[PDB]
Amino acid sequence: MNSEILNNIILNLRYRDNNLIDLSGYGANVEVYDGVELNDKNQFKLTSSTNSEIRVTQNQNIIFNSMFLDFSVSFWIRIPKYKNDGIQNYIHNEYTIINCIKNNSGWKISIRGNRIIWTLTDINGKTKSVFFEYSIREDISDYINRWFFVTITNNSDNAKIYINGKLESNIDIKDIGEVIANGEIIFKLDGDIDRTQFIWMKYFSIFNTELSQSNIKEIYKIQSYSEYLKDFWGNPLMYNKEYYMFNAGNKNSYIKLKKDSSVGEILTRSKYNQNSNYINYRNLYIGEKFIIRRKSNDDIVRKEDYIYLDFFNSNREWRVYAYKDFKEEEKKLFLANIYDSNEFYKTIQIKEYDEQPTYSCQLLFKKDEESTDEIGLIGIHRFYEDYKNYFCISKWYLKEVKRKPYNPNLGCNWQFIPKDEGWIE
Ligand SMILES: CC(=O)N[C@H]1[C@H](O[C@@H]2[C@H](O[C@]3(C(=O)O)C[C@H](O)[C@@H](NC(C)=O)[C@H]([C@H](O)[C@H](O)CO)O3)[C@@H](O)[C@H](O[C@H]3[C@H](O)[C@@H](O)[C@H](O)O[C@@H]3CO)O[C@@H]2CO)O[C@H](CO)[C@H](O)[C@@H]1O[C@@H]1O[C@H](CO)[C@H](O)[C@H](O[C@]2(C(=O)O)C[C@H](O)[C@@H](NC(C)=O)[C@H]([C@H](O)[C@H](O)CO)O2)[C@H]1O
Hints:
Elements: H1 3-6, E1 9-15, E2 20-22, E3 29-32, E4 37-38, E5 43-47, E6 54-57, E7 71-78, H2 87-92, E8 94-102, E9 105-112, E10 115-121, E11 127-133, E12 148-154, E13 158-163, E14 166-172, E15 185-191, E16 198-207, H3 213-224, E17 242-247, E18 253-257, E19 264-268, E20 290-294, E21 306-313, E22 316-323, E23 330-332, E24 334-337, E25 344-345, E26 348-351, E27 362-365, E28 376-384, E29 387-394, H4 396-400, E30 414-417
Antiparallel strand pairs: 1-2, 1-16, 3-6, 4-5, 5-16, 6-15, 7-12, 7-16, 8-9, 8-15, 9-10, 10-11, 12-13, 13-14, 17-20, 17-30, 18-19, 20-21, 21-22, 21-26, 22-24, 22-25, 23-29, 26-27, 27-28, 28-29
The protein binds a molecule of 6 linked components (BGC-GAL-NGA-GAL-SIA-SIA).
A molecule of 6 linked components (BGC-GAL-NGA-GAL-SIA-SIA) binds near residues 249, 379, 381, 394 and 396.
């Protein structure tokens, strides 16, 4: 990790012993109230409950306001989807999530529907705001209810917002005077919110430098790294959990067992079809309900694990298999009940070929016996009937995944979508 990053951390809020602590080395006081849900993946949840609050008292014995002339804030956030019957309140109602104010001066992070807002107030009461807005009209959003990485950088001249390491917003703040930035930091939802409103956050940090684009991309990569695969939302991928399947190479496509058949046909997602012309999305809770089974201390799926890919068909667990008789470059997968056959492969190795941050994984068929032989990767392909798109195994992907840079648009890139309280359709 670049010393430009490490040498300049003045607040580093991290999970420790069923608590959040400052690990910067400056010793800020952190009070987590009983309404904050914490987990050992460093995620914390702010709710509408009066006791859902974190109070951080910066160490004013060591931390001087002059340190915040150039400064940056980074965190990950997961902001739930609008309620389809609540779109007006979503669009209009601004709520604070993090507030650092002394005598009406300081900095604030707030949300209004689909925008995240950075506000600076100087000691004269002169305010300037910069914001990031993500679309609520995309077929498939990178942002709605999914973990993403925010970095805000400030110097005398500019306030910038980066999202997943890329610049999204930039305002001139030359006219903004002295900002008191060393006060108490309050993590708490504050505004005209529904009872059901919540925000997830992770890895909240403050740096007493203006982080470079280079520095921000490095933090994004380091904080993205895991030994475990992730789901579509960015949470750890789990065994024994029901998941819809998403194809990162054909985002509007889903798998359905073809009626009375043993193959998965690829169909096009339905779309939001109610009144509001403010919103558009493709349905996520569609197609077969899959479940990942261990082939042989936690239920987390790790890179290189051996798995069965199963799904529920008419009240019974079925399995995804690949025919051993496989002369062509691609072949439809065989969907059937759970049984052993010398005629098919059942064992999948779950892979991450991508070097760059991603929630996609890849699914490699192997022989039952612990062998280095690679059969093929699960993907999509058009087969002669006109041509029709099917759930397939492909030898073609074996060479494509070895190409640099890794192509995230390959049809062998899958994500697993569990039902989530932050996504109601
Ligand atoms: C386009 C095509 O049909 N590709 C299939 C390929 O067909 C061979 C010839 O195609 C090329 C090619 O890949 O483009 C032509 C190049 O010139 C070749 N390059 C060389 C030699 O350097 C290249 C290579 O030879 C091979 O790739 C091997 O490495 O092949 C194609 O032109 C030719 O077409 C014939 C046709 O078959 C005949 O019917 C017709 O009469 O004549 C034409 C012209 O001759 O056929 C060639 C083989 O006979 O063959 C490979 C198998 O080797 C694949 O089938 C390939 O198609 C790809 O298959 C995989 C599954 O294995 C997927 O289905 C790919 O689709 C996806 C995916 O990755 O899953 C779907 C995704 O939705 C999509 N993402 C998007 C749109 O966001 C991705 C994405 O487009 C690509 O991954 C690239 O980013 O594709 C499917 O493309």
